[PDB]
Design a protein around this ligand. Sequence first.
Ligand SMILES: CCCCCCCCCC(=O)O
Ligand SMILES: CCCCCCCCCC(=O)O
Lengths: 248, 246
Amino acid sequence: KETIKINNIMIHKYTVLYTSNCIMDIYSEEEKITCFSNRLVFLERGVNISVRMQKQILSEKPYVAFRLNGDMLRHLKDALMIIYGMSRSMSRKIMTTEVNKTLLDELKNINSHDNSAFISSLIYLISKLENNEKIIESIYISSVSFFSDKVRNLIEKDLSRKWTLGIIADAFNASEITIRKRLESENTNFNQILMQLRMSKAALLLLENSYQISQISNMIGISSASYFIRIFNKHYGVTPKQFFTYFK
Amino acid sequence: KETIKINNIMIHKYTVLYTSNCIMDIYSEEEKITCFSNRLVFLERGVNISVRMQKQILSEKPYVAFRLNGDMLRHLKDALMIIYGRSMSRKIMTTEVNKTLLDELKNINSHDNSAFISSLIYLISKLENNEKIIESIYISSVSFFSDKVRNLIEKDLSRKWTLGIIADAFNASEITIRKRLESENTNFNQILMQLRMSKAALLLLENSYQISQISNMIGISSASYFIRIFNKHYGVTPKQFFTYFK
Ligand SMILES: CCCCCCCCCC(=O)O
Ligand SMILES: CCCCCCCCCC(=O)O
C-alpha cells in the first residue's frame, strides 16, 4: 500500500512542506485539510496533527520538507515585524498554497547553506503570497518561548536520563502542581512532552538510514529495541520498519 | 547629440539605478566608474558625483532609478542587520544583473512597501561580493549634523537662510556650525544649493510646473535667475535637462 496514516505528529520546528509526489489529509483537531498534488504547506510550530497520505510515485519520497530551528525563526519573526510592522483557529495554524512559476523556480535554487540567503528567500516568498497575513501570524505565534519549551530544552540536554515530574519540579523552583497546571494550561503534560521528544528524535534518526534500531533506542533513552518498537507503533500508528519503508 | 554631462549631482537618498538603456561614466572624487548596458548601480547616500551618459535608444528614458527615503532605509538597515548580523569603491558599486534577477526587478511594483523591502532584500541576498553593499546601507543610514541642517532647511525651502538663522535655531555660534559642517566636508551654502538644485531637478522631471513655480517653490526670486543658477550648477540648462530625460 502506498498510503500511510501517521498519528500524534507534533511539529517541533516551524515547517514548510512541499508535496513533491504525495497527497495528504491533515486532521489534527477534529478538523481536516487537504493538500493536493503540487502545493506548499506551512505548519505552525506546536500543532499536534495526524496525517493520511497518498504517494504518487511509489519508488520516490513522499514530500520535501524545510524545518526552521529556533534561531532562524526568531530572526524571521524580527525581520517580519520590521518589514510589515509589529503587532485560536487550526485554519490559522496550517496553510496550503499554490506554488507559482516564479515562487517555484525560487524554491529550486534554495541552498540551505547561506542561512541569510534562506531567510531572504523565505521573506521574498512570504511577500509574494495572497492572504498572507495568516502566515505572518503563525510565524510570530510559534516564535515565542512557552514553559513547555523551557521543559523541552531542559529534557533535551540529556534525552536518555530517567526524568520525573520531580526532577523538573526541582529544576524549576516550584512544586509539581505548578508544573502540571502550567503545562496543562498549554494543552499538554510532561509524560507527553517526553514521549514527543523521544518519538520525533527516533523518526528523524530512522530516516537517516545509518543507525540500528537498538542504537536509536539507546539514543532516546529506551532500554529494549523491541520495547522501543512497541512504543513507536503505539504512538505513531506504524512500526518503525513500515515508516522507514514508506519514507525511503 | 544624445550624450549629456551633468555635474555636481548630490544623492540625498540611497539610490539603486538600472541602466535601462544607457552607458554612463561616474566621477565620484577624482575617480571614475563606467556602467555598461544592463547593470545595476548602488549609490551611497551623501555622495556627490558627476555623470557623462549616452543613450541607447533615444526615444526612451536613460535608466530606471529607485530612491529610498529615510523610513524605508531605516527599515532596510534594521532588517539587514538582523538577517546577516572613505572609499568610493564602497560608495558607488555596479553589478551584473542576471536573467532571473532581472525578471525579479520587472515584477517590482513599488506600492506594497513591505513587498519592495522584500524584493530589495532578496536581490541583496542574490549578489556576489554583497558585503560591500550592506556596509554602505548602514554607513548611509545614520543621522549627521548636515542632516539636521537639511531637515531644518527642508521645513521651509524658500526662506532666505544664513548661517545666523541656523546658529540661532541650534544653540551654537556660527563658528561652531561652520566647523561641525566642516568636519563633514561641506559647508552651509553647499547644503542649501544642493537641496534647491535637487528639488528643482526632480520637479522639472514631473512635467507639471512652470519654471517660475519651481523657482518660487525652492526659494529663488527670479525664474531667469533660477535658469542661470541651474545651468551653472548642473552644466545644462533646465530645458536641456528636461528634454534629455523626457
Ligand atoms: C509529516 C509526517 C512525518 C512524520 C513526522 C516526523 C517527525 C515530525 C517532525 C518534527 O518533530 O518537527
Ligand atoms: C545619474 C542621474 C542623475 C541625474 C539627476 C540627478 C537628480 C537627483 C538628485 C538626488 O537624487 O538627490
